[PDB]
Design a protein around this ligand. Structure first.
Ligand SMILES: Nc1ncnc2c1ncn2[C@@H]1O[C@H](COP(=O)(O)OP(=O)(O)OP(=O)(O)O)[C@@H](O)[C@H]1O
Ligand SMILES: Nc1ncnc2c1ncn2[C@@H]1O[C@H](COP(=O)(O)OP(=O)(O)OP(=O)(O)O)[C@@H](O)[C@H]1O
Ligand SMILES: Nc1ncnc2c1ncn2[C@@H]1O[C@H](COP(=O)(O)OP(=O)(O)OP(=O)(O)O)[C@@H](O)[C@H]1O
Ligand SMILES: Nc1ncnc2c1ncn2[C@@H]1O[C@H](COP(=O)(O)OP(=O)(O)OP(=O)(O)O)[C@@H](O)[C@H]1O
Lengths: 50, 328, 328, 328, 328
């Protein structure tokens, strides 16, 4: 009966404003696939501080 | 003191001694549709098994009555080619009814009764197949998968709007798929009594939502707030703070009814709020923000509210003191 | 003096000399759907039989025109392999159209006309199969199996509520499956007359249910009471006790319309009450009780009422004496 | 001077130069559903023919590329057993895609490319079969077969009811099958003009039916009369007798919308009445009589009326003279 | 500053951090229905491939465990006739599950475990086939192909009607197929605030369409104009010209909901107008003309308007100056 379900900070504590590895898997945490995505927009649009 | 409807739409009421029986032979389909998947699966599988085995026994018995298992003399031709064991007749029945028909075991003209059996099994196979397929269809077109995504905050708040003290609650839809003709029926329930004296345990009063038109339809894309303005005609016009509590006979039944976008069928979600869950004097914090070229519905902190004081008396005494202060 | 609608929803009215004919070739499907199960079964079975036999005659005739039954000379190859009797051609037709195709009797290139027959029978088989399956579907998705569980007490009572004399009746749903947008249309019917003089035999006045919103939707989980408040605009405002009786031209048609939960389709139940069944001066006893952690709808004694006196005069004379006592 | 809607529901309006194109690849299904039966039949048949012939050419070409038509040397085994003519490959394609598979001509391991072709043809066969069957279903579940039985008298009459001059018409349902939530939208249409001056050719004003509740639902079992009470808010409040005629720009669009009983889908019938068909000063004779233990709806003389005089002036001048006679 | 709904019905709002997960194993069907055609096709094809290959491995393994690939001694009979390569077992699996069954490779009584495998594969084949076919059906019965033909002019105009300043817009239907119970829900949205102070980003007020009955249903055959009369209760009663502009927080959400004629299911189209698209002081030119014995809806110049001046102040100041000029 008991799922001991969850308290995931990866999404929750992030609250929607974050930039780092934890939500990414160990694989990307070694190979920066998320960082690939992050750079993906830097071509189509100049980055900004917001 | 039970909840009328669970916080997840469960109608928490047992029937206990219906008089009559069920539907003669139509309740089969209805009771078949809404039912746990593995049980329905098993029922259909076992229907196919029994249909196969029955005609398997039939074919085997026919071959045995034709005197076709013993002789193998070469002269007399079988009712059906090359069957020597009940296993053979069973394979044959499967080949027939599933419409496979390999050919190594084949019906012959030597037994017209066997031809009758063939016709019978084909007709039965088509009938049972169409029944199973109609059931599987109307089951795979099932609703209430969406009715679980239609979320409702665990709490409802009251506040002051337009100088009036109106009961509110936030509604939530999580799927991008759209509900059509989304209609709200807030409905307060309690054990209330007429002046003449009759009391009914679960009395039900349709409390109208405050809509600029007055109707009950909404257009839910971003999870919004549903609210009732408490007027002297609303039963909640005698409600006061601190009267609400989990031991106060009080509950407001919230009904959401609309058409699924992909499937033209209709679904209904239910949620309820008894007295304590109705937080007094708060406001749901706006979970929407103008995103970068977008509207950002922060679904996090969804039902998170904020406390605000208020005149801690009935809307009755609200209008009392208000009339006393306006006619001054 | 017949009942307009039976106590079980039967519209007890015959048509007697419709002018025109029916639907050219679409009435077939509609008249096919709603129809007794064994008759529909038999119709489909016999459709399959005739479809099989027709092409059976076709194949047999082709083999016979090819000069393929007599010779067996060994040289000339048949249109279709190894058929020697009409029984053979019939087995072949069944194998083809049911998509079994054992193989002992098989189409050959020697007759292109036979290839045409094969194409024809396959197309016809698929068309007839899809028709039968669509019909079986829309029949197995049939409604009004639920419309029988929607029960209504054999009697309706009037009493005093809010100092007002309102006509009531209890509604009942026996299935745990839920009806969506359950809507009530109480409708009084009699042979009434305009002031100018025209009378119509079955005149129909939609008598509005008293709903806190004013609309006609309900939320029926526990079998509740539907009621109309008799106002000077209600036609029943001239009604009096002892005016009701089984020989008083009077009847109130009760309509329940909603969407089945599992099948998004809509159903309607009907019940009616003529003058005598409308018990004067009673109250339906509350059949609900707070069970142990539950709400106990005692479905037994469902329509059992209790007698209560009342001013035995018209709501007209009610307001007359009430105005006389209030302006005193 | 055309009729907006024909006396049989035909929307007598052409579009003439829609800007854009149609639906990319979904209009196929919609345009497929509502379409004459033989044309749809032919389309499906010819789809099956082309699907069979295409893979027939495929198999034949494969056998010919394998060098399997010429040699018959006995050693080299074919891609597919025993095909020697394009007729053979065509029979094989039919056996495969129709799932017959006699066996005399059978796929062999000697050509994996042939195995690919087999997989391809089976997938295509299942996809095309499901498409054809879904189309045949939603076509055999078609509506508007009932929408033809919903009849409407060729004429509409006005008379005096409740001292008021109300426009009427009789409605008719010929099927014993019941319509659910039968809703009326009478709608007068003409080339009318705002005070500011703008005129629109087919202006449309929803003229409300007089219902005791006020809503637009009815309960049609015995063919009854629909009627509008002409109030100072009704556009017909400036209408007079002898103003109606087939050259008077005037028409009242009558809409009937409800759910078919057997098929939970919705249908709509349309009928219209321009000025002349609106007979002035008559009453539809009651075509119902209390039969022997039954209600006899004499469907004969269905729309037959009876002439009755009336003040031959506008409801405007009606209220004028009425106020002059009451304030006297 | 994004658009709430795109000019083509796209709900331009992202969810961003839903708390929970999806539907356990029912979201499969819903997410399956509405999905790009080639992706769904591929999913079903690959389901058939995996189902075939799995049992192919099964049959091959069984033949190999029976010691049936090596010997070919002639004495021991196989579990299944004449398979010598995994290619053989794969062809056999395809023949079985597709119900073809040529016959050259056929199940034998020598392995009851093989009979079990046969039963298993037939049951799985029927289950998967019914699932695929139900999905293909409810996908081919898809809506929103019609919802694209329901067109709306890129602009909305205001003008004077009945001496009143009413917001308008023209609606358009391009298909001759009819929508049933076509209902309009104009709904203005902005970031508005209660007097007490709470602001909500996307607040939503159902602005009622001006209908002679008051309801929200229409009857769209010729593309007509929808309009709201701006009353002191309308939120737009504080609107003024030159207040509208693409940087004015303002938008009016237009909802069209009805039943498709051929498919009894319901569809919804959406269009929106922010402040600038709301052209001030114009009138849509009548695109209808009485054709030769017909009504000519010139669908060209569909949304083309004409400019007309007007008092360039709020409906508030309209009633201000109007009361000042009438009480003079
Ligand atoms: N961010 C969210 N996304 C989706 N569903 C949510 C979210 N937050 C809550 N819910 C659902 O709404 C229901 C009631 O919401 P409630 O107001 O209790 O949220 P909560 O538990 O207070 O979480 P939070 O504090 O994040 O709102 C819960 O059953 C929960 O599953
Ligand atoms: N008894 C009836 N049963 C069914 N349909 C009828 C009947 N009478 C008329 N109709 C249909 O109603 C439509 C209009 O009816 P109308 O009032 O013209 O009847 P009618 O032609 O005057 O015949 P009658 O004089 O018998 O009423 C016609 O298209 C007709 O098909
Ligand atoms: N306990 C019950 N459960 C289900 N259906 C019932 C029950 N009681 C009555 N009904 C149904 O309701 C219909 C009318 O109800 P009615 O008021 O006549 O009940 P009744 O016959 O008086 O029985 P009771 O005295 O128990 O109410 C009947 O046709 C009956 O089938
Ligand atoms: N004649 C027409 N037929 C069908 N659709 C049209 C027509 N004219 C415009 N539309 C559609 O209506 C939508 C908005 O209409 P709009 O008023 O912008 O027309 P428009 O672009 O001004 O063309 P026009 O000047 O011909 O009206 C557009 O997306 C367009 O596809």
């Amino acid at each position: 009966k008991t799922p001991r379900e969850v308290k995931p900070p990866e999404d929750l504590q992030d609250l929607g404003v974050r930039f780092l590895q934890p939500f990414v898997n160990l694989l990307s945490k070694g190979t920066y696939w998320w960082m690939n995505a992050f750079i993906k927009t830097a071509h189509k649009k100049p980055i900004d501080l917001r | 003191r039970a909840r009328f409807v669970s916080k997840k739409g469960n109608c928490n009421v047992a029937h206990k001694n219906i008089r009559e029986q069920g539907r003669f032979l139509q309740d089969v389909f209805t009771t078949l549709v809404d039912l746990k998947w593995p049980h329905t699966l098993l029922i259909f599988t076992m229907s196919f098994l029994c249909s196969w085995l029955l005609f398997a026994m039939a074919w085997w018995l026919i071959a045995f009555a034709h005197g076709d298992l013993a002789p193998s003399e070469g002269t007399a031709e079988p009712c059906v080619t090359s069957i020597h064991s009940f296993s053979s007749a069973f394979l044959f029945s499967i080949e027939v009814q599933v419409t496979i028909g390999f050919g190594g075991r084949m019906v012959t003209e030597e037994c017209p009764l066997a031809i009758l059996i063939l016709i019978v099994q084909n007709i039965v196979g088509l009938m049972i197949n169409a029944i199973m397929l109609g059931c599987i269809f109307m089951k795979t077109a099932q609703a209430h998968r969406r009715a679980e995504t239609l979320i409702f905050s665990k709490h409802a708040v009251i506040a002051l709007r337009h100088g009036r003290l109106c009961f509110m609650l936030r509604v939530g839809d999580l799927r991008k798929s759209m509900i059509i003709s989304a209609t709200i029926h807030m409905q307060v329930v309690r054990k209330t009594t007429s002046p003449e004296g009759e009391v009914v345990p679960l009395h039900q009063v349709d409390i109208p939502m405050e809509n600029g038109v007055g109707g009950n339809s909404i257009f839910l894309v971003a999870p919004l707030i549903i609210y009732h303005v408490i007027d002297a005609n609303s039963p909640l016009y005698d409600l006061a703070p601190s009267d609400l509590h989990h031991h106060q006979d009080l509950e407001i039944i919230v009904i959401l009814e609309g058409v699924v976008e992909t499937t033209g069928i209709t679904t209904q979600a239910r949620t309820s709020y008894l007295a304590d869950e109705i937080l007094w004097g708060q406001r749901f914090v706006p979970i929407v923000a103008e995103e970068d070229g977008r509207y950002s519905v922060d679904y996090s902190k969804f039902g998170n509210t904020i406390k605000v004081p208020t005149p801690l008396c009935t809307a009755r005494q609200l209008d009392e003191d208000h009339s006393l202060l306006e006619a001054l």
